[PDB]
Amino acid sequence: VTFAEPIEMLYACHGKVRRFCGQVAMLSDYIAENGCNQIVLQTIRQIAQYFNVAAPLHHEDEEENFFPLLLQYAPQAQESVDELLRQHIGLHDNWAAVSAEFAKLEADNAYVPDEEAFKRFVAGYDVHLAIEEPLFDMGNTFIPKEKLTEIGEIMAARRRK
Ligand SMILES: [Cl-]
Ligand SMILES: [Mn+2]
Ligand SMILES: [Mn+2]
C-alpha cells in the first residue's frame, strides 16, 4: 500500500497500532513469567519508537487532512470527528503513562510495571479504532478519488519532515 491510496494507508497504520497494542497487552504477564529480559527491552523500544514518532504523524494525517476532507463530503460525521479529536488527547496521555512505565523498566529491570497503564492504553485504542474505522469506510464511499489522491501527496511529504 502507498500514499496514493491514503485511506488504505490509514488502515495500514491501524494494523501497526493493533500489533503494538497486542504486545502491550502481553507485557505484564510476560514480565512476570520471564522477567524484564532482553526480549522485553527490545519490544518496548520498538513500541515506544512507534508511539513517540509514527503515531503522532498518523494523528496529524487524520486531523489536518483526512477528517476535514471527510466532512466536506459527509458532514453527518461532524460529532464523530469531534469526539475522535477529543480522544486523540486521551491517546497521548495514555501513551505518556505507558512511556513512563517503560522508562522505569529500563532503569530497573526488577520493577513491577503498572498493569493498569498498559490496559488503559490498549483499551483506549480499541475504543478509538472502533469509532474511527467506520469513518474510513464513509470516506471511501463519499470522497472523490481525486480529492484523496490530493491529500495522499500531502501525507507523503509529512514523512520527509
Ligand atoms: Cl488513531
Ligand atoms: Mn487512526
Ligand atoms: Mn485517530
Side-chain angles (χ1 to χ4, degrees):
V1 26
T2 174
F3 284 108
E5 284 131 41
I7 302 180
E8 291 280 68
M9 180 61 77
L10 294 168
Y11 272 117
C13 285
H14 286 191
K16 292 191 164 99
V17 166
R18 291 188 193 279
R19 180 152 316 93
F20 293 129
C21 284
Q23 300 178 342
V24 170
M26 285 183 53
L27 214 39
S28 282
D29 282 355
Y30 186 92
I31 287 160
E33 290 183 35
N34 299 289
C36 182
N37 67 8
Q38 298 302 121
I39 289 152
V40 172
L41 296 172
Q42 294 287 100
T43 297
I44 72 185
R45 168 184 60 74
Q46 296 161 335
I47 294 162
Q49 179 56 44
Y50 185 82
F51 292 101
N52 280 324
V53 179
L57 297 171
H58 172 69
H59 295 343
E60 187 178 7
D61 294 340
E62 293 174 345
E63 298 198 6
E64 292 315 305
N65 308 115
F66 172 73
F67 292 153
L69 175 61
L70 175 66
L71 295 168
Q72 294 173 27
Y73 288 90
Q76 64 273 23
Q78 184 70 59
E79 288 67 29
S80 301
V81 165
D82 291 339
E83 175 57 23
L84 296 166
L85 294 174
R86 299 176 194 104
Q87 285 181 9
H88 284 177
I89 297 172
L91 301 176
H92 301 345
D93 293 341
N94 292 344
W95 166 239
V98 169
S99 179
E101 296 307 301
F102 287 0
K104 290 186 263 195
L105 289 167
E106 286 176 1
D108 177 5
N109 300 168
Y111 174 62
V112 179
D114 184 359
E115 187 164 19
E116 170 59 9
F118 300 159
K119 286 182 172 167
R120 172 174 197 103
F121 176 79
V122 172
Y125 267 107
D126 283 341
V127 167
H128 185 76
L129 306 181
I131 299 164
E132 194 169 72
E133 288 190 341
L135 272 61
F136 291 178
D137 302 348
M138 299 169 73
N140 270 325
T141 297
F142 297 124
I143 302 168
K145 214 274 212 201
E146 298 81 2
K147 291 274 176 181
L148 292 170
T149 299
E150 183 177 41
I151 61 162
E153 303 160 338
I154 298 159
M155 291 161 56
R158 189 162 287 124
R159 270 61 184 182
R160 296 193 267 277
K161 206 182 191 186

